[PDB]
Amino acid sequence: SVSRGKNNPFYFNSDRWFHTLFRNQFGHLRVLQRFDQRSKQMQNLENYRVVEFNSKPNTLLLPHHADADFLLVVLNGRAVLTLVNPDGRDSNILEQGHAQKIPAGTTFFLVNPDDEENLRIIKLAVPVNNPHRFQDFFLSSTEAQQSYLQGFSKNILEASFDSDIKEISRVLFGSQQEGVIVELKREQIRELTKHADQPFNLRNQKPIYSNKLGRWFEITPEKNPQLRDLDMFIRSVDMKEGSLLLPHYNSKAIVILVINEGKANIELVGQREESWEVQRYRAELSEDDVFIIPATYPVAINATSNLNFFAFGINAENNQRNFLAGEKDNVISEIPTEVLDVTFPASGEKVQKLIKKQSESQFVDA
Amino acid sequence: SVSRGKNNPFYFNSDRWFHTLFRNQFGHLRVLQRFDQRSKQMQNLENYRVVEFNSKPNTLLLPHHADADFLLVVLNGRAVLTLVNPDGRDSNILEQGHAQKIPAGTTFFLVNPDDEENLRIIKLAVPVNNPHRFQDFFLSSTEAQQSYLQGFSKNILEASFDSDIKEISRVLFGSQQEGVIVELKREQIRELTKHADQPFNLRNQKPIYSNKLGRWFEITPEKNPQLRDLDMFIRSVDMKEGSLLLPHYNSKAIVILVINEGKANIELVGQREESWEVQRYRAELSEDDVFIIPATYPVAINATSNLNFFAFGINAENNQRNFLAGEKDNVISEIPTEVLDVTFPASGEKVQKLIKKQSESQFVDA
Amino acid sequence: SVSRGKNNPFYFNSDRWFHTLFRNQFGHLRVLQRFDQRSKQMQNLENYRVVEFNSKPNTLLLPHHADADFLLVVLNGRAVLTLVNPDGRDSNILEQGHAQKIPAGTTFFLVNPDDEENLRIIKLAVPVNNPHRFQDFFLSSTEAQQSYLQGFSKNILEASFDSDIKEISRVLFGSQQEGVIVELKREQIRELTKHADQPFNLRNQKPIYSNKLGRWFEITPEKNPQLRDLDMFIRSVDMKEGSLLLPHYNSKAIVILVINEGKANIELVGQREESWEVQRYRAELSEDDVFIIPATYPVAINATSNLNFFAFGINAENNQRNFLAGEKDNVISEIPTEVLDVTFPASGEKVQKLIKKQSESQFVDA
């Protein structure tokens, strides 16, 4: 059978599965729903949450910290990310394709320095106190959320700050703002931009696979400490419409892919819903949707438009890409004849012959 | 709202939440109840149990082993801890403030060498077979518990020991003792005290924070192997009555604190009971009570008496202390003006000014 | 009380607890049932599954890959194991007593080169996507299972392979085979045998314990990378009928033992079904049965026939063997007199005397 869209567990449609935590004229912050909820075939993803952030030009996400580690990737645009610690501040500008880990509890803030290009960010979260959920703690005081300092008693805030509660409530609490995302004057932005491990960029190196129809960029834990702690890989691949990414599977990594821009059909061959029968999963992906590719499941992606997609690899270290067709990295073709002769009905010379036909690799026609 | 005592999830009152496993004229052994039971905000603490031990002078806890690792800390007094292995014995005297890991399965015993000072021990347990519970296996045979050797059949015990079951049952089983804690003659104690990684001491080094009102001692995994395996930190801080430990939060470590001696009010600002509203948690702590401070939650402690408290830091490596007031380690004050100007209603110069007022650090008045 | 066979949780009778996934004239593939299902005393084993494979001479297990790491051990016979990767093939012959890790997702196959000796394999599995279950994905197409390539649409398979779906369905799909285990001509086998970390062997080194009645072979993570990743040990011990393996316990490792050949009675002293009462667990083990020995539980094995058994040690690093009787590795006898004098009713000199009697070690009479 072919589980499609609606009843397909791995397809995560944007405007249905995301939950908006905040939204206004300058941006929105929404969280994808829990994975494990939908299927035990994704049990091990329960410790992770996907977060999407949209920010209009010249705006700022007020200071706050969550109780989760954060892998931050910039899908489109450029933002100035700032981390502050009890002993010091640290800022960097991030171009599209850049990433950076945000230790759990690190107060920080973002601003879209640009004057007309929007900011799009994907965030992989890993909660501390509870595997399935995290808590943002906002320092600011706005009509939307309340400052966390406002959670302490007068006696404390008074002693802590040395001042009558009144002087405090005036300066720090109730002339404010209405949301956690506020616009700034270009003068102000220019101010906090003269400062701008540390952020690294996936699309800044020899891609892994490449050809007329598409290129594949990937960065692994082996070559990056921040990535090695999360034990995960970043991956970004763009294909021309009409392209096909040949059926392949990841050795042990579980993949969370998000569609940056473009359209595409995905075919995933996996487990049904303790037998050996295999079921097919299909879905049409579009901008922002999320699709989960379980470890070892064979998958094929078809770009029915010029698209580019980001993928997080959970449980990545020493993961391998096994292509079931084509020349490069084609496990199928490493099986000695005498075996595939018995594997498939046809004769080994015939099966092989069939295999060796498609002289292309990874990114072919359609 | 302000969840207080009774309905506050993180407050663990001594005489209600502890479960006594043994008790007599010379001591008691009780276990704190499971954390995760009370709130999903403490899900990740489910793998840990707190154990309290009280021992009158000149007594001994008979030989046994549990199926859990054990972080042993001596709150008050001094005890002689002995570990025995198939290839050898190892003993050390531990003064108050000392700690030492006890590998799971290591048979051991404790004795209070002292002649009039009681022994108080806190124990952080990490079970093996079951995440939530551990099993003590006592070698001794007393009216309280039964020897585990008594669980084997006659045919085995006979072959294993070479002797009729009768000679065995006499020597090893049913002239014995009534409890697992027995008193000894000073002569006997003096005997097992001439022997007395290895035990380390938290209160034996430059404290982290210090002033007229209090000092803070902390030892981290970075600087201690035993601690690095458990990936946790030990911490001990004493404050003068009237003192206040300024609102602060730990970057990623979850903290299990126990009150050694003294009284104190605690204010913890955390999550309610998937929104951004913040709730306040309050409670009055007294000798032996246990309070759990979730990672990243802002907390303030007030010593309404001269107290000293121990704290275990779970998930400690690279954890950071963010103070929301005061001079030292005050994240608030590392945020550039132009930002806190937009963060809080008042002007940046005013907010800042307010911040820079309290010239004290961590331990202030009240 | 004495929980026996039927109601004993740790006893896993072969023909009742195994589930056959495939079976024919040349072999069978069956999976043991989930551990945690039967008792919370085995909660931490939930991430593991036991797999048994039987293969008649001169046969082959067709190509496939599962979504689980695999510790492969050859109980009896010799098989030629082949791993294929997108960049290359790797084969080795394995004699009885050999082991080797099979990374999750690595396509592979086995063949019994021998001409009259059967192949017996035990497999410890560690699933990726779901802690409790794994998925075999077979490349072949047979009346039993269906090829996973048959899960992709015509448009894909066509583009992926460059050929009308018809030519494909003929060569790769529906002259085939009826099962995943097929027999081969000696000519064929001889073919794939001229190639034959890498496989290591437990029974190829100074045993740990040894004497007239039996020897004990063990290999630990300290001395083997593959083993260090799984953080587990391999162990193989053969005893003469009438022998007794003296009551002992593992410090922190949980042990999954399987009976290769022979008969034996096992006595395990563990927890009942939060008190200190101890219950006894007994059972008669026979060829292929599986018995689980929880960390720190005292156990005694009696060979009521000449047997040999394999054991996997989960959570093995720095694990210790504490013998409660005998000379070598007898914790009991490391306890100083003055203590065992108070531990047991009898006098220390008497208890000790009793202890020092049995001059044998590990493997004694009965």
TrEMBL record, chains A, B, C:
SMART domains: Cupin_1. Keywords: Signal. Pfam families: Cupin_1 (PF00190). Residues 19-169, 200-352 form the Cupin type-1 domain. PANTHER family: OS03G0336100 PROTEIN-RELATED (PTHR31189), VICILIN C72 (PTHR31189:SF41). Belongs to the 7S seed storage protein family. This is 8S globulin alpha isoform. The lineage of its organism: Eukaryota, Viridiplantae, Streptophyta, Embryophyta, Tracheophyta.
